[PDB]
Symmetry: D2
Subunit: 114 residues, 4 copies
């Protein structure tokens, strides 16, 4: 099944934050309006926050997360959770290696903001 | 129901990150084994990270999040999600006011690391 | 926080199923736009499916689950999860007692159908 | 990423319930101890329950859901959710066709029971 693609409410501000847990340099691209809107890169085995940004989901609401290591796409796993019918998280893990920890790049999207 | 309490695997490193979306200064306490191990304080209405730390779950694995504003405990909402039977998130929202957006402090716990 | 209240897409068919895990007879009420649409009841310590029904979310999309035992309201816990940006579950547990297993009545709402 | 595989606590009873939403007759296999422990079969486009059973997760705790239609394996999507640090759901959707509704067989695993 397709992973790393989320339909947000249209025209909504959201937070996106990426963490790294791998020997390899992680590249995270976040797409809105089907165009890259934020990019984060870095190597950490200590859960570094390789970047955090506020973005706008735009007229379609479509947000896509892509992860690669030196151009090689990582395998993604994702889901969305809603708490008290109001607070939304879109969650992504990614695997760059063989161990299947799926924490090599972790991405968390949250909305609403403010 | 009790919210903001999670049983992690024992003696495991985990990441904890807090975001703020409120006029009020948020104070996040992270307890391991019923003692405060990390505290984050900050103010933002734009999802700013007010703290990030790597902790160890210790012999019990018991991790608790508490949030206060101006010494008043916030109401919490929480859940844990596991992706591909490997990647764990414990998610907390909190409400310091009347709008029930539950984003006033948002806390993301993730494991494993490395 | 409020629990057991879900906003579904409007005018959508959804499934609702209830399971029992208690010495007490559970009564599960499912409200659509604040009116009882389904009522299930039974007594099992072995996960009996005490009712299952297909309902329509109608114009508001508001679905609420309430549980009573001993004519006393049970305490609820809930969340919504979305898989592959398409498959939705609204999950409810309830506690009628003191052991806080929150499985005394379990309710699962799923959509889309067909 | 692997889907439909869950690590439960060892030697623990769990419920498994399967629903159908497809023209195709669904075959749901639940493996424990890497051996088939239960098989459900049926057809519905109205979310009918095609099977419900209580199984034991065994010494490993490894539970695996597989779905097939006329001997062709369906593509799975899954996740686990924990509410109030006590109530666990393992959720599976499956796709046997081209519309990617992932509801053709839906499987809900819940524990603990009793
Ligand atoms: C330190 C190590 O770094 C990566 N592993 C590798 O890059 C790797 C690639 C190929 C073969 C073996 C290891 C990660 O996938 C792994 O989870 C771990 O964080
Ligand atoms: C900016 C504003 O800040 C807080 N609101 C208050 O401090 C507040 C003040 C007065 C009355 C009610 C609430 C938050 O709870 C609210 O979600 C919003 O983020
Ligand atoms: C079998 C038992 O049934 C209820 N418990 C009681 O009825 C109860 C009886 C006596 C004292 C306290 C509670 C449940 O809350 C409990 O989770 C368990 O399923
Ligand atoms: C009624 C219909 O039944 C199946 N569809 C098919 O059997 C199908 C498979 C391949 C091509 C066309 C149809 C399902 O995948 C679909 O979601 C819908 O529930
Ligand atoms: Ca890895
Ligand atoms: Ca890793
Ligand atoms: Ca608020
Ligand atoms: Ca707020
Ligand atoms: Ca109970
Ligand atoms: Ca019980
Ligand atoms: Ca289908
Ligand atoms: Ca279908």
């Amino acid at each position: 099944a397709t992973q790393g693609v989320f339909t947000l409410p249209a025209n909504t501000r959201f937070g996106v934050t990426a963490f790294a847990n791998s020997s390899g340099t992680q590249t995270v691209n976040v797409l809105v309006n089907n165009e890259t809107a934020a990019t984060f890169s870095g190597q950490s085995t200590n859960n570094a926050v390789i970047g955090t940004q506020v973005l706008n989901s735009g007229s379609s609401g479509k947000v896509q997360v892509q992860v690669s290591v030196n151009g090689r796409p990582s395998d993604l796993v994702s889901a969305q959770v809603i708490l008290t019918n109001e607070l939304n998280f879109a969650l992504v893990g990614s695997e760059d290696g063989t161990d299947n920890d799926y924490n090599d790049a972790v991405v968390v999207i949250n909305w609403p903001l403010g």
